[model samples]
Target: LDFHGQTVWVTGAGKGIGYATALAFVEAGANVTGFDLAFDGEGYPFATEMLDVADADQVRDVCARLLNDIERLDVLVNAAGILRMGATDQLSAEDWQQTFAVNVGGAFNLFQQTMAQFRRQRGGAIVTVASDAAHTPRIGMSAYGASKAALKSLALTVGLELAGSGVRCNLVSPGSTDTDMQRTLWVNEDAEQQRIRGFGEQFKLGIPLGKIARPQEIANTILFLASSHASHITLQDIVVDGGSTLGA
Candidate 1:
């Protein structure tokens, strides 16, 4: 809950949950290092750099630079991601790759880099932002869903690997938080209906919480998991979906 003097690195920090978390960490007295593609959002109060986490070489170089310059990386929150629409039948093979590249690949890069720093510094915490699509798949998220599913699995693997090293890996699967990405998916009204129905009809109607989550609502949970309050937990995927996974 308290991050006094910790050094936190956030990816996809230009907007949405990432943006909110960056500010939250700063407000909590932790120094923040933010990375995102050239994108627009309400500006951040701490240091932010443009790092394309999807690019492997860029991830390596930036990770190295941050490690050398900052001296320590106490926490990593990977919220940088992309979304792709279109059903599997209409989607191209490249679409899958793109989804994996940004969602899974980006998270993988940051998680590894943070762990490398942890090994040298005794340990750290990792909170990876996966999605509800990872488990409860909808129609059009074939590419996106599968990638997140894999990424979640990867998180568990990492958690297991770091079990004894003092490092922890945790996964967060968010429901439909009101955000630019959600709005963009609604670009085509019909598709949005399908998207809504996928959740509202099949998932939402059955959820105990009975509503979608806000971006900051989701970010708050990520912050908790990243904090020392959750130091004993690892290798678990927690869904912040208003209980959408429980369906009629």
Candidate 2:
């Protein structure tokens, strides 16, 4: 496996997709670390500050320590994001700030740090977990969508910047996965059911594939990009939303 003997770092490993991604990398023989607010309580591989990803100092300190220890990062995944539910009229200033801070800011901070490491080592790979909302849109999702949209743009530019450095950057957009972050917006059972049903009635029928993605399903794609198998791939965005964006 490509990850054998490599050092990988994943953010927001408290639960849901981030946790699964960390576990998946560990299974591939990578030495993985979980940096998040809390553990998923499922045996964290290596633990670090869950402080603030957007904070330059925080990211710098944590990154410096990790580099001082392991020295190289073969795989870096930025999966930590936040969403606040509200119509544009009802959205708060804090909502926008929080969303951007955790989503766009975090990704940029992590990406810069990873790129520095990759440059030092001559090459590395980075993946940012964006969302289908970035390309498509939904009501009451302005902040989340905008932040992720920025991430996709940043990833593309980073891909260009890393060309000479042997570091490749890609974006993986997962669709409607049932995770804690998703659960917040889908809290009301009836509303959640209707939302999911609407997905089936509208986009699902158009899908070339007939279902939404499981967390690992997205993780699987991430792992592939993290591996040598995708050595030639870079500066691309892969939507794992089961063809929902195909006008299906």
TM-score of structure candidate 2: 0.89
Model 1 ranges with Cα > 4 A deviation: 184-207
- Worst 10-residue stretch by lDDT in candidate 1? 190-199
Error at 153, model 1, angstroms:
0.9
lDDT at residue 71 of model 2 (Cα atoms) = 70
In order of appearance, the predictions have TM-scores of 0.89, 0.89
State the lDDT of candidate 1 residue by residue for 1-248, as single tens digits. Answer: 78998999888888888888888888888889889996575557988889999988998888887788876778888888888878888988888788899988998887767676777776788888988888776776778889888888888888777767788889788877777556545345534333344455433334456556778787788888888889788887788877767630
Give the poorly placed runs of model 2, Cα more than 4 Å off.
Answer: 40-42, 184-196, 199-208
Q: How big is the positional error of residue 38 in model 2, measured in Å on the Cα after superposition?
A: 2.1
